Write a protein that binds this ligand. Sequence first.
Ligand SMILES: O=c1ccn([C@@H]2O[C@H](COP(=O)(O)OP(=O)(O)O[C@H]3OC[C@@H](O)[C@H](O)[C@H]3O)[C@@H](O)[C@H]2O)c(=O)[nH]1
Ligand SMILES: *[C@@H]1O[C@H](CO)[C@@H](O)[C@H](O)[C@H]1NC(C)=O
Ligand code: NA
Lengths: 706, 10
Amino acid sequence: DQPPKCDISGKEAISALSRAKSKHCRQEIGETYCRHKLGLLMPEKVTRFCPLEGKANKNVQWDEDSVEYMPANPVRIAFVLVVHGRASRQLQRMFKAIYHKDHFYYIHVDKRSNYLHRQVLQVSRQYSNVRVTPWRMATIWGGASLLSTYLQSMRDLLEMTDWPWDFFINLSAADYPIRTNDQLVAFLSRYRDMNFLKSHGRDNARFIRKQGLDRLFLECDAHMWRLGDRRIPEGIAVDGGSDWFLLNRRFVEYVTFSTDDLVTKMKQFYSYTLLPAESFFHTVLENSPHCDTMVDNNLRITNWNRKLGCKCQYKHIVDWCGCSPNDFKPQDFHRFQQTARPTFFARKFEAVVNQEIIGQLDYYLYGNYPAGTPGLRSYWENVYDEPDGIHSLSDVTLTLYHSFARLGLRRAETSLHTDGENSCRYYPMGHPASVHLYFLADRFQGFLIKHHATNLAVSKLETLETWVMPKKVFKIASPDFGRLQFSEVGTDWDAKERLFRNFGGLLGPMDEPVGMQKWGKGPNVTVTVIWVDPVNVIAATYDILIESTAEFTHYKPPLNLPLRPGVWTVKILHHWVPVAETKFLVAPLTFSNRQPIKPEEALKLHNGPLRNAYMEQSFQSLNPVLSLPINPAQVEQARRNAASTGTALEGWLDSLVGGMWTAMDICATGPTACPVMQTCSQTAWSSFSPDPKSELGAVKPDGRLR
Amino acid sequence: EEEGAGGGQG
Ligand SMILES: O=c1ccn([C@@H]2O[C@H](COP(=O)(O)OP(=O)(O)O[C@H]3OC[C@@H](O)[C@H](O)[C@H]3O)[C@@H](O)[C@H]2O)c(=O)[nH]1
Ligand SMILES: *[C@@H]1O[C@H](CO)[C@@H](O)[C@H](O)[C@H]1NC(C)=O
Ligand code: NA
């Protein structure tokens, strides 16, 4: 611990120093603060080179003719795809829609998203006009690194002499085209000296403050630390808006290689800025010699709905509140057919949220697939891949993925009816090889687990995939007609899209469950919620008001940890009248730090709360009124269960899992000795079955893949 | 709606 180079008195810097974890990060915080304190970090005045008195906004005549013609000198486009996460099959579908042999594709995958990177590598190895960035940054939301990514990729693309591109377009894995490639090329060939950037469209002083442009930030330890105030440089006009844009090669060359006062000082200023790509390119362009080429239109449709998108949901990543646009739904299709202004792309789309709208758009642009094409209403998304290691899972998911595989092996044994040797009996081996989410018609169907096991009849290793689906537990007790439509317990509630991102509702003893209710239209009402643990202990009780306009409600009761393992129940009443109920599972864990749990560990984790009570308030008075007697025998058995390990613990776990999950089917990836097991590639549900909408083949005569 | 993802200090 070395003292700083200057006295540090700013409250914001002190807070950051107290919260930072690495000493390298604390040192960089102190250096940045001290250099700014001496006035040596930020520029204070900048030269403006634009001859205009203000903005240009050169309009574009949006007639039907401007898009239908055939150009003699068509532009060639360089697409930069900035992607992260698990949605590789949707990214392949979108890549299919935008591909043409005359364009170029340069793909940056977040350094954290290793699964997606391996899938992207397969694409780049197939096509000569597709490349991946060798460098990979941890492009956190709102981070300064997103501008560093764009600027490095621009320098890279300019040095690739074998790629003669005319325009630069950036896209995410949640973007999609809303016009054909032919119409895009025709439009850009007509306006090839223009730049397309969209401004905020409001009070400019309010934009600066809302964006935090007058505050100093530092990106370190995958976090944006706020370090204090700063002045907007004098002599230039500051503007901003959307960081999705289209820029021509001439302007990208200026941004990259110019050494004049404007470009130099702006690259320094924006190295310490939040959401830098949302104002850097606006500010440079409007003050540069190229200011007369700006079109106040980014040719995008962004589905902003700040009533749902502004929840200050990134506080753990950045020292600021942010907003995000919503995902499109089927009712939004008509918005893509507007011709008030020219637009060629839209965002956001998410296949795990709603795939129907994606299909409607793709078929509308490029037509239906042939009759009999499989998998068009399905979606598969990988959530664990063996090369990433079991330490990238948690003790919870590792425990439950193991249990799901055993549930499949028991189904294989049961499905064969014979009086001789059972050629469908298996012994599990190793850890799961992969796990997929499975959707059909925008409805979650469960998990697909790929795993290895020994067929005991022939004593040979086989690779299988199991499909497990959760049992339906929501029950309406009303006989009479109220507003309640659904009730659910989970974690990682997404306030913008109104769903749990823990799709399987997988829970362990140290998790903090969230209760959600879904309501229909109607007058105000007040209801009672009750949480019941596996041995009929009442953990919490509270009342909630449902306003006439409320659509969803949720609450996370403060329950002391650890939770008693078993099947919990959540009940809703209306003045003591039953309304509805639902159940959820707190699973006992078989692993500790990815190793088999030990007796003292298990006893500590599976014997209920440490303080011997879920809350300070007690609800023993309600047990008789609700007919919830506590059986002294079941309590003692729960204590015996808490001390179990190994085989006894595995039987307890699988018994609970089997009561809340169903092994729907199991298939073999290769040859098998089980006579009743289908080959995975021949099923309709396996991740090995055909999925042509996301498969990439040879380039067609017209230069397309779709 | 308008553009710009910044939502203020909080
Ligand atoms: O952890 C992350 C987060 C984000 N990103 C990348 O950063 C870009 C924006 O991410 P998201 O689409 O998740 O962010 P939003 O949906 O909130 O977008 C919106 O708000 C943030 C702004 O930067 C976007 O320009 C705006 O459209 C994407 O290209 C994404 O791939 C990462 O690479 N890693
Ligand atoms: C909602 O409930 C009644 C419904 O008529 C209404 O009068 C009241 O003002 C609203 N708010 C409450 C009850 O808190
Ligand atoms: Na390639």
